[PDB]
RNA sequence: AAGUUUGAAAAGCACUUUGGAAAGAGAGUGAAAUAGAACCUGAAGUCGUGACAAAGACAAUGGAAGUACCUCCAUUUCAACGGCCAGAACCAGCCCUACUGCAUUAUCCUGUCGGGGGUCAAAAUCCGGCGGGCAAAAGUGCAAGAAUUUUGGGUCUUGG
RNA sequence: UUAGGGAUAUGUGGCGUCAAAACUUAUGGGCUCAUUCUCGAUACGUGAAAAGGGUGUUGGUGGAUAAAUCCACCGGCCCCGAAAAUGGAUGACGCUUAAGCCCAAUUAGUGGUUGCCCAUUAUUCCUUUGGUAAGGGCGGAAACAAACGGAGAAAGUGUAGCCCUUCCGAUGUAGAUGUGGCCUGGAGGUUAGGACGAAGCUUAUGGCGUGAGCCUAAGAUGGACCGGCCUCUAGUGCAGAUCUUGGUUGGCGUAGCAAAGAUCUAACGGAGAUAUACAACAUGCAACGUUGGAUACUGGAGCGGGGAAGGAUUUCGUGCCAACGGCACUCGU
RNA sequence: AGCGACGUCGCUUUUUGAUCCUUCGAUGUCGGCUCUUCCUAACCUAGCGCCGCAGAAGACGCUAAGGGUUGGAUUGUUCACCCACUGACAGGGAACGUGAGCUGGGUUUAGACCGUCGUGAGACAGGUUGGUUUUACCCUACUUAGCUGGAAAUUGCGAGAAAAGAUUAUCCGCGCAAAGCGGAGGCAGUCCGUCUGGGUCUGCCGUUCGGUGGCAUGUGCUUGGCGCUGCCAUCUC
RNA sequence: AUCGAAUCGCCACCUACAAGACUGGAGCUUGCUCCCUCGAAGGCGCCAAGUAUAUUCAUGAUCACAAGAAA
RNA sequence: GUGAGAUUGUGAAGGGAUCUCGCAGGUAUCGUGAGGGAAGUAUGGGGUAGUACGAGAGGAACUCCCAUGCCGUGCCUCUAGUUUCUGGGGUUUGUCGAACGGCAAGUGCCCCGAAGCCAUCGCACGGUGGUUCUCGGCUGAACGCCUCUAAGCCAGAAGCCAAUCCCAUGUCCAGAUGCCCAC
């Protein structure tokens, strides 16, 4: 196990409940690379813990081939004299995210590496997060707002697969899985939902009079 | 300023750093690409080095100055007893990696292959696999062996087959191993549920080599090259040894770098090493694949000498001593010396080609000594150029 | 080069004990033996040893400002009491914020009649004539409007 | 334009993250797409680019033919022109409904009138110190015991400043001067201390001064001298000279102790052993002398036997192992 | 096509100058050898456009520096020339890379000779022969070789799974799943308090293990031997 | 078991997807008209299991980490 | 809380308090592979062919086949090199009385010499996808036509990226498993 035995021990000799601390999680698809790292990197620093989640889908302005040149004139920087030590180059998009937040902050101090390692990036959606709360979406980082629909631009998964990161099919494979896997759990609740959506409505008949007529007023009726 | 005249560099910077391997074994770093149509089949197999012999045969190449002719190839010979196929595991797929799912072990397992997790094992308590052999059975562990199994099933994308050496079956007294070398093998072929209806049946139960190499096939052998110690820098790398009147030496090299980078670069050869480095050679075509002097002798014996003979040399295997069990002969040297273990894996390489395409029909297989010069192929040949001896018209007087 | 200056006095450690011896452990002399022979005081620098503080690689130190744990050094307080820590009221000063008037408009306002323009047909944008006039408001120019004159905030940025 | 601090406000420069400020401001107008030194984006800083080109796009001027079109010319941004040696630089990431360029504004035709952040600056408040400093008080007004409103008040350059109120300045190399300004060995005075512990020494011993420094506390330190104050006096203040002398130290149990072939065994000596809290090896290692035996070297131009020069007790016997014979001695010059 | 005068605009820092900013209590000062790497203004190698490109050979240009770029005679030479091979024998940088890496032929000393110059000692960026090439054990780099902590990157107890599907109850297998299905040891004494339940111990009988005694088959296989399964039985569990 | 902790929103209705030159449905006239659920709302929690007749609270003595801990 | 140990300057023995530390991992195996390294490159011959082209003189190339140069990673069956195996034999001077056995000449010298090591002086092996540039096109406007481009698309270089190959969890793998503990 990655606990310890002992914290496993602890917490069974205190008893208590499990515990899962206050995290957010933003979904990224169609996000812009460089504004939605910004925006991650400042929460980074006022203390909150953020899961990051679809990078493969982030996007960045202007054509495929430029972004893959940017990508490739980033390679070819490394330690000329021992490059086990030179700049290392990550491919795989959850990788090119945490960079991009991490250059943006002041990682040689403990509180630089305090708020990046808050920070927790995926492809795809993995089942560590797929059910708990609900996504969020940071609306200046979207693309439909950003970038005019004129302009090229790029998915950040696409222009990583041809680079060295040959994950891109085994998860375009697990997204495929879960989004059937969860929209056959979603219209199998419609019956459910339908149920309270009608118990509001039926409900504010038999309801006491004088209270629907608040409800009608600060308008929830 | 520009070097005056440009050369090749010496070595291979892909084989870097030269260091010393983690093992002896020789794993294979990867398998062939499924076929998923061919029916499941296991990729590669451990086998230990005895020596080298040549071999005449009649080469069929037509466009060649060789074309029927006979041509002598000197042949490694690597004998193979049979692996026991302990386990089965089975690999999901991870957008970082694979990882393994579970592992489902047969029911019995020798003290061969339990030999290795002890370090002493004849003072040890002897207890390893002791709670599962007993868990196995009973209800709660013939449950938990079907759900992995189901796991395999529904999760897994590769499965692989825990086998090992069987070292009494080998019986060699210069190996002196009494511990069972133990690798995974994977079973290439077919859906994912028909490699476990495959590797289920093999639990507990052996696998000769011919099931999983053919004759004239090719295979490429993962290996453990020999090892020298600390070499200088000739012997490691190419580096065209100084001048006679050199103060401090002459087999160094000169000049090891610019002012600027001001560092020793990696590029520059330096001195040490020069090790048992694990190496994977490619397209080794395998000449015969043997049988056990016990089953079937006359090993080295064809359709053209039609001597009784066997493929292990007057007076055996220099530091090796007699093949006993089924071996594998392939042509040309494979890295690491005598007695180690090594793996043949099903050839990765695309092969289409006269050459690796081809039917290996030999004619001769030299059984000679290979102290000395032996001039002698079988024992009769000898006592024929003698005949009674000093020592001979002795013994006859013990009658 | 080198005080041979131990102590008042040699009283310069008898004796037991481990050791081949050097010495060690005891004991004894003396106010002091951490005055035991170079022997008064016995510094700096460097090293050992117990305890403890922690500490990633930013060479180490350094500045400023906190906090954590110690310290037991200092001063103070211990009952109709305090020189300690907190809040809340009021007072002077200071700072800040809210609160608005005087002029000005015309290359304008609004009728109407000629054009002119367009549209299925009109109106409008637009030029001219003749009446009337205050766009009642304008991002015009200046602004002095007593913030306890029973009610604006701040002062752990001042003192009571 | 800099005495030590606080507040408010600002300058140059800025408000996507790094990084304080638009949590990426506006309910402002345009223009721009740039494929391996990767479009562009801090003046001074060629700290990088020209001539010449472009039916890329966006404007304008002139002329011309009539459903709109055509010819010439001139701009803006962008592109070509545009090739260097370690991987690399709008400062980094990155930005394209700009986080780029030009212009403009302040919560936006809704009322005019200061968006926000940061200086050793400005304004103001407190504290210091110095003035070409400015002014006031200084003839004790009277009253007044403990027990069960106090205390100062000096005719003054400088102090622990005679007291108080006020105003301006305050950084600085070389250099000049001031200090009732700190320290040190001594001499003239004066006042004290000390075996109930002087000088010296040591300390997470605190207190005072802007500072040199002073002073108290502790010593499970010491063993006999010594402090303050006025004046005199000088061999009077240390971190640096390839400074002098003594000591110590990292490098370091490191380089190394490799010409002249070489020793071995047994018994005896010796403290140097055959050294042990359910056998012997696995738990006393290595090394020494003499005698016998073995093996080997010098090889008569000798590690043979005698003399000069030079040394001068090294010669010889007994004892002896502290130091010395760069390892070891039980041996020895 | 390929050139391109008279003019004109630039680039490069592999030439030589110009300057004198750094180093005179010292940065070892020519060339070769060795070795690595980088640049592209591309000689060969890959792909292509164009020609005064019929073919063959080649001219000019484009992307492109991944790979390759020699054996010798003479010279101290760099440079230069000729011989010979080759697909080609491209141009360079890295303190004019590279002397605690070497070499010491040259320059740049003391000896000596000649020529020219000087009355003379002596000079000559002229010629000649001979002329000491010192140190690494420190730090980093690099090449191999070991030991070893560590996620708050040593601490906080500061909790995040590229897990699975649910409240003390699912008891398990299957199913995307819905629907739906097949399979679950029991009995008799104990403690403790929330639909009776839990927590153990004990007595009793069973299935799947466990280990003892007999009989075949598959596999392997000796140094006629090593070992395991298989049915039955008993025993233990 | 040290251990006393900083944290202060729960959920088996959010915890599926997609688009933004567009996503309630439709008609020709293609920017207007008409229809619907009217196109701008995850649910719940915030002191009686529920909006009405109730019912312990102190002395923890005006602030102090909330002296509280399973929504 | 529980176990252990400390509290060392001026004597002994008590007790008390306090401080520090341990209190759950250990050990063995099979694997994942982020990142970093990176490699094969070039020619000749057969054949096409005396063909295309050309008046002739002359004179190509691709698929395919076979070899080779340079480089790389190995290997020791063969052949070659090496011998302190002082292996066996020979042999010179000296030497133990001769012979035998030897011995000294720092390995006397000579011939042969296994194992090992080793040689482009021997032997073996050295490969697959994709994104793009240049360029040639398709569809197709701007601009009633035209146009490879403005939007979209095709083909596509020894370049660049990945597969293979080398080291690999300080990439802290909640990857899998063996066994003993602790809970």
């Known amino acids: 196990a990655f606990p310890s035995r002992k914290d496993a021990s602890r917490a069974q000799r205190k008893s208590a409940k499990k515990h899962r601390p206050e ?4 979904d990224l698809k169609d996000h812009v690379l460089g504004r939605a790292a910004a925006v991650v990197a400042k929460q980074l620093l006022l203390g909150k813990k953020i899961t990051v989640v679809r990078c493969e889908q982030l996007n960045i302005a202007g054509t495929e081939i430029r972004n893959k040149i940017k990508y490739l004139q980033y390679l070819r920087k490394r330690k000329l004299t021992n490059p086990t030590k030179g700049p290392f180059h990550h491919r795989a998009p959850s990788d090119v995210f945490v960079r991009t937040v991490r250059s943006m902050l002041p990682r040689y101090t403990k509180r630089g590496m305090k708020a990046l390692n808050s920070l927790v990036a995926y492809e795809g959606i993995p089942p560590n997060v797929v059910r708990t709360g609900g996504r969020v979406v940071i609306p200046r980082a979207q693309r439909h707002v950003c970038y005019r629909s004129e302009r090229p631009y790029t998915v950040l998964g696409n222009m990583c697969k041809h680079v060295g990161w040959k994950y891109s099919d085994v998860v375009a494979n697990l997204e495929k899985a879960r989004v059937e896997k969860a929209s056959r759990h979603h219209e199998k609740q419609a019956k459910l939902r339908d149920a309270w959506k009608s118990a509001r409505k ?5 309801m006491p009079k004088h209270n629907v007529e608040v409800l009608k007023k600060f308008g929830y009726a | 300023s ?16 030269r260091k010393r391997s983690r093992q002896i ?7 062939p690409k499924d076929d998923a149509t061919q029916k499941p089949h296991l990729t590669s197999f451990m086998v230990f080095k005895a020596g080298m012999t040549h071999i005449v045969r009649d080469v069929d190449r037509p466009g060649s100055k060789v074309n029927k002719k006979e041509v002598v190839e000197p042949v490694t010979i690597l004998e193979a007893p049979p692996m026991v196929i302990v386990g089965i595991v089975g690999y999901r797929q991870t957008p970082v990696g694979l990882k393994t799912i579970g592992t489902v072990w047969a029911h019995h397992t020798s003290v061969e292959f339990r030999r290795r997790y002890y370090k002493n094992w004849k003072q040890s308590a002897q207890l390893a696999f002791s709670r599962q052999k007993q868990f196995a059975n009973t209800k709660e562990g013939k449950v938990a062996e079907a759900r992995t199994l189901n796991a395999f099933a529904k999760k897994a994308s590769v499965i692989r087959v825990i086998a090992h050496t069987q070292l009494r079956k080998l019986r060699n007294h210069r190996v002196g191993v009494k511990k069972a070398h133990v690798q995974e093998i994977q079973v290439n072929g077919g859906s994912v549920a028909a490699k476990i209806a495959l590797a289920k049946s093999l639990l507990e139960k052996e696998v000769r080599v011919d099931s999983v190499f053919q004759q004239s096939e090719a295979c490429d052998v993962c290996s453990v090259t020999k090892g020298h110690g600390t070499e200088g820098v000739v012997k490691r790398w190419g580096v065209a040894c100084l ?4 103060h401090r030496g002459l087999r160094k090299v000169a000049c090891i770098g610019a ?12 001195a040490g090493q020069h090790g048992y480095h694990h190496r994977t050679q490619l397209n080794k075509k395998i000449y015969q694949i043997g049988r056990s002097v016990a089953v079937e002798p006359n090993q080295a014996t064809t359709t053209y000498d039609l001597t009784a003979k066997t493929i292990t040399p007057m007076g055996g295997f220099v530091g090796y001593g007699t093949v006993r069990n089924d071996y594998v002969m392939l042509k040309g040297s494979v890295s690491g010396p005598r007695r180690r273990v090594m793996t043949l894996r099903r050839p990765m390489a695309p092969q289409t080609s006269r050459q690796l395409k081809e039917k290996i029909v030999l004619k001769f297989i030299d059984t000679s000594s290979k102290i000395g010069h032996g001039r002698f192929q079988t024992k009769k040949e000898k006592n024929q150029w003698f005949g009674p001896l000093k020592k001979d018209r002795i013994r006859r007087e013990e009658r």
């Open chain 1, 202 to 206: 039926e409900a504010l008949a038999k």
């Open chain 2, 259 to 270: 002012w600027h980078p001001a560092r020793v670069m990696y590029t520059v050869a330096r």
């Open chain 1, 23 to 26: 995290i957010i999680v933003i």
């Open chain 2, 243 to 246: 001048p006679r009147k050199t």
């Open chain 2, 2 to 17: 520009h070097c005056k005249f440009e050369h090749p560099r010496h070595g291979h910077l892909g084989f870097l750093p």
């Open chain 2, 25 to 31: 074994r020789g794993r294979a770093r990867a398998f």
